[PDB]
Write a protein that binds this ligand. Structure first.
Ligand SMILES: [Ca+2]
Ligand SMILES: [Ca+2]
Length: 954
């Protein structure tokens, strides 16, 4: 790190407020001249947006474990005004709630400008601070994995708060928290990757315009934090038992519709003590029709369930007037919760008490309190709803359930809204209803939504992004409030959401405006790890070219400050996914720093568990054996790719440490037996959280062996011999126990009660093949399955698993089968106009809100296999020695007539290869690479040809 001369500062009384955006301003007189570069070092909790003299300079910090809080260093020489007063402005977003990429600490900002060994500015009590005006701290929690979707009322926002000439005389002074090193940020460590990109991209088209209406009542509730207040300090799943209650009063008799955008969490809904047995809606949505008479009615919604986090939705609509009020003491929120009768926190790798649903009051309450009066007998359980966890400004619910949706032809003028032209797009004003615009980016993107417009004060601008829609069907992001609401001040204004969102289609809905709104522009500032299209692949098969294209795009969008599973739902660095994502990255982009950064973050979870977390740095203490095994694989692959022995030495201890503890989980049977999340694929694999799951037993063998490479590269090869012995013992036990003679294949698992599974999957067989556990006769048998998968076996359910399958086909020399599989499986994605690779394949019920959905996430880089295999298995480019000191060129044209591509090299430069058949059985091949790289060339079986090898200077 560095020695700081600045102090962590914050403002307000609460140390860690929920969902609060706070502004900071600091000024200083810059010297007439400065020799060296003027560096600005900064970090914040939770995230920040930096401005220097009014100009937005950057965002951060990168995700960190509070123990090693990463700080950024910017060269601000470009924004610095020599010899005069300069202004530093910062917007700090403090979550006040833990998630999958942030561990709750406390609000704070620390920044220091240094030049020529002298401190020119530093955060301290002299700085000014105030909450961002109009930012509602009760806005919806975005998702169990992320932060919050914002609601901003610009009428209360000081637009020029970041400008040098802004008058902050009335702003309170900031409060010092302490010097660098003050808890909870034990140490401040320098950002270990370059800065992310941020490029303004305009949309491709306007898909539709509609006159619409949201439900009279729509609210987003954070039931997790309301029912289990302490859950704000972690991101583990919790379960609670109880109800949501409100008194519905109708001025006159009429029909009322209860809407549940995300469904009913518990066993059901009760009205006046009567269980509503009828309802409509496409899962997970549900709507109830109530034919009520004038008067008061007690509505009780059972919410007993497991809740990982995120907003729960409740809506009501009727042609009749109605009011709502809490059965408890008035506090502003018309709802109350009853409970918490029982609860529990789930740590998937540790035993723990589970919530029960037999509490006597919970069971009797519904029917025992048909009125608010009768509810008095349960008064001790009726609690008010915490205001900050409740909001009626619900963009998601207002989009999922539209009481009116009337398509209108798109006026030419409106198109101007997505074009970089001077003429604005004038939106039509409907006499009765809102104006909904569906903006199509043309492809999935990830970044910050921005716009500029002119509108009457109070006009509501709602934004909601989705990944997929087709012919009247919109796949809503259930579980993700991918939204923001902006309320207009008078006149022209601009806004850029500081919350990252991933989506392809943006529902932009304008409400409450009396006069026409002029949309000057709507766009997205895409942001990813700095990648250039240095790698490439094209061939005679246009379908394969398209699969490569979406694989490359998917990888790009899943590369932030760390690799992430997806840009929409989570934006989380999942360890398992990163192994495949890194390999694809090597072939399509060639970046290495992001890979090492990710590999280095994993050991930081050692304090939580020696088995290591499946996603980091996170507050969800969760473990998936295979993910940790894939981390070891990724470490080996990274060390071999770069030839970075220093890294191998640094990481070896962490590798040895975790493997040592996994071995302790092998019992009498001599097999890995664990009580936890024993996952591999999203398919009907018999992989119980119970005992002996075959696939992870197989990967442990390979992990134990793969570890040697790191040990040897680290210069301590002997420290891995013990693991090598255990691998043999394990492999033998596996072949001795987990194999079925009659079926001639490995069983999925052995249950806790010792019951051997009768379920057979392609997955387990593929893994046995790749891990080298299946040898001789059994190997040949597995190879038969590879070329002809038994339809009776469980099938591969995700392109993630397809990746491992392709590695097996490569090992078996079945490249043509690999190509046909890619054509079929990725071709189906393209059929539905995919611009990125799907998380899972269609027709599998796992991991999705509705079994009819093609997939949950439409952009998961763990599914970008073609980006790696086309260049490696087909074009023919493979690493031949660590650090690519030698390269093996062995094309496998299969049924292609030509192909060409480029693979970047970690040391710089690239490997360019092109080939085409000039006549039957005869190829023309060109190879270009740096002169110091040895090239081994092998034409495919029975093929002759002309090879042109070109070497250029390093
Ligand atoms: Ca314009
Ligand atoms: Ca030459």
């Amino acid at each position: 790190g560095r020695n700081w001369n600045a102090s962590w500062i914050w403002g307000g009384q609460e140390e860690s407020p929920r969902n609060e955006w706070r502004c900071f301003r600091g000024s200083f007189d810059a010297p007439a001249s400065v020799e060296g570069p003027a560096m600005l070092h900064i970090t914040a909790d939770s995230r920040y947006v930096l401005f220097v003299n009014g100009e937005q300079v950057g965002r951060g910090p990168v995700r960190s474990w509070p123990k090693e809080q990463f700080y950024d260093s910017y060269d601000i020489g470009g924004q610095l005004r020599p010899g005069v007063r300069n202004t530093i402005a910062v917007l700090v977003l403090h979550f006040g709630v833990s998630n999958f990429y942030y561990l709750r600490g406390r609000g704070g900002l620390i920044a220091e400008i240094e030049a020529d060994g002298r401190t020119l500015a530093a955060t301290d009590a002299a700085w000014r601070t105030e909450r961002l005006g109009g930012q509602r701290s009760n806005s919806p929690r975005m998702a169990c994995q992320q932060g919050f979707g914002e609601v901003i009322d610009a009428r209360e926002l000081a637009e020029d708060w970041a400008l040098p000439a802004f008058d902050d005389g009335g702003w309170a002074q900031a409060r010092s928290i302490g010097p660098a090193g003050t808890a909870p940020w034990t140490s401040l460590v320098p950002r270990d990757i370059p800065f992310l990109t941020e490029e303004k991209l305009y949309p491709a088209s306007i898909q539709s315009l509609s006159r619409v209406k949201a439900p009279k009542y729509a609210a987003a509730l954070d039931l997790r934090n309301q029912m289990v207040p302490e859950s704000v300090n972690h991101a583990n799943p919790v379960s609670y038992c109880g109800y949501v209650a409100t008194i519905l009063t109708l001025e006159t008799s009429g029909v009322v519709t209860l809407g549940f955008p995300t469904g009913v969490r518990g066993s059901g809904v009760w009205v006046d003590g009567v269980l509503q047995t009828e309802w409509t809606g496409v899962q997970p949505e549900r709507y109830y029709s109530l034919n009520l008479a004038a008067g008061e009615h007690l509505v009780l919604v059972d919410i007993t369930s497991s809740d990982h986090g995120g907003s729960s939705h409740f809506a009501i609509d009727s042609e009749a007037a109605f009011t709502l009020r809490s059965p408890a003491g008035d506090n502003g929120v018309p709802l109350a919760t009853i409970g918490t009768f029982d609860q529990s926190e789930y740590i998937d790798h540790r035993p723990g008490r589970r919530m029960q649903t037999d509490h006597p009051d919970y069971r009797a309450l519904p029917e025992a309190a048909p009125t608010a009066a009768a509810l008095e007998a349960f008064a001790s359980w009726v609690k008010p709803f915490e205001p900050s966890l409740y909001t009626e400004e619900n963009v998601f619910g207002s989009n999922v359930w539209r009481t009116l949706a009337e398509r209108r032809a798109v006026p030419r003028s409106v198109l101007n809204a997505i074009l970089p032209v001077p003429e604005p797009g004038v939106l039509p004003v409907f006499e009765d209803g809102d104006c909904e615009l569906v903006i199509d980016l043309g492809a999935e993107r990830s970044g910050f939504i921005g716009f500029e417009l002119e509108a009457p004060a109070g006009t509501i601008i709602d934004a909601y992004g989705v990944e997929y829609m087709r012919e009247g069907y919109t796949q809503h992001t259930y579980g993700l409030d991918n939204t923001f609401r902006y309320i207009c001040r008078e006149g022209r204004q601009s806004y850029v959401s500081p919350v990252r969102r991933g989506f392809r289609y943006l529902f932009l809905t304008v409400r409450g405006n009396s006069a026409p709104v002029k949309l000057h522009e709507i766009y997205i500032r895409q942001s990813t790890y700095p990648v250039a299209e240095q790698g490439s692949f094209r061939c005679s098969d246009a379908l394969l070219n398209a699969t490569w294209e979406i694989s490359r795009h998917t990888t790009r969008l899943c590369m932030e400050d760390t690799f992430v599973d997806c840009p929409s739902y989570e934006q989380v660095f999942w360890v398992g996914d990163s192994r495949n994502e890194a390999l694809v990255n090597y072939y399509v982009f060639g970046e290495t720093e992001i890979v090492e950064r990710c590999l280095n973050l994993v050991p930081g979870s050692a304090d939580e568990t020696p088995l290591y977390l499946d996603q980091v740095p996170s507050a969800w203490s969760s473990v998936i054996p295979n993910w940790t095994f894939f981390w070891i694989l990724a470490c080996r692959e990274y060390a071999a790719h770069t030839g970075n022995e220093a890294f191998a030495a640094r990481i070896w201890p962490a590798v040895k440490h975790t493997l040592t503890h996994y071995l302790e989980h092998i019992d009498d049977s001599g097999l890995l037996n664990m009580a936890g999340w024993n996952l591999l694929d999203w398919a009907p694999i018999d992989q119980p959280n119970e005992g002996i799951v075959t696939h992870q037993n197989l990967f442990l063998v390979k992990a134990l062996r793969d570890s040697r490479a790191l040990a040897a590269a680290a210069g301590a090869t002997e420290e891995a011999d013990a693991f090598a012995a255990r691998a043999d013992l394990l492999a033998e036990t596996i072949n001795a126990v987990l194999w079925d003679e009659e079926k001639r294949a490995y069983i999925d698992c052995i249950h806790a009660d010792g019951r051997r599974s009768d379920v057979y999957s392609m997955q387990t067989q593929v893994v046995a093949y790749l891990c080298g556990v299946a040898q001789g006769e059994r190997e040949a048998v597995i190879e038969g399955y590879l070329s002809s998968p038994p339809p009776a076996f469980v099938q591969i359910g995700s392109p993630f698993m397809s990746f491992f399958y392709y590695e097996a086909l490569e090992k078996a020399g079945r490249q043509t089968l690999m190509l046909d599989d890619i054509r079929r499986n990725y071709g189906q994605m393209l059929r539905y106009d995919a611009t990125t690779c799907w998380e899972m394949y269609p027709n599998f019920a796992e991991n999705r809100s509705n079994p009819d959905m093609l997939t949950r996430s439409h952009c998961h880089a763990w599914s970008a296999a073609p980006g790696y295999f086309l260049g490696s298995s087909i074009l023919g480019v493979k690493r031949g020695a660590d650090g690519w000191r030698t390269v093996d060129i062995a094309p496998q044209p299969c049924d292609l007539t030509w192909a060409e591509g480029v693979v970047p090299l970690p040391q710089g430069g690239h490997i360019a290869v092109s080939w085409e058949f000039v006549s039957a059985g005869k190829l023309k091949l060109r190879i270009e690479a740096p002169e110091d790289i040895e090239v081994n060339v092998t034409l495919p079986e029975g093929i002759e040809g002309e090879v042109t090898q070109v070497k250029y200077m390093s």
